[PDB]
Ligand binder design. Sequence first.
Ligand SMILES: CNC(=O)C1(Cc2ccccc2F)CC1
Length: 119
Amino acid sequence: YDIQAWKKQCEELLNLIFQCEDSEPFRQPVDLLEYPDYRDIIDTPMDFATVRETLEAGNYESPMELCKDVRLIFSNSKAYTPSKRSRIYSMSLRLSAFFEEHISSVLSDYKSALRFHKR
Ligand SMILES: CNC(=O)C1(Cc2ccccc2F)CC1
């Protein structure tokens, strides 16, 4: 029932994601000079270094907010490269499955702790 436990759990899951080779294209913002039409398609760029920095700055109130930003990394990649046969699409699907598999208990434990607090 630890209301704060999600933060270190998210730091550890981000460490695992950075160690995955599938995270390479997502570790820093998409270079706005290599893909000059990126902002024509993507309104809100997102990447794992921005997520880690937002978490470390104390600028997420809950793991649901972190989860929303991570899901935005994958929806941005699917919008910019829609081909299910592209290198980035297949890496996105694998990394997203890994992330969702691990974030599920973090969200459940956080929500359970808040319900216990307000019992
Ligand atoms: C998340 N990155 C992307 O969406 C792009 C760049 C990119 C894709 C694949 C591998 C290296 C890469 F640099 C297409 C813009």
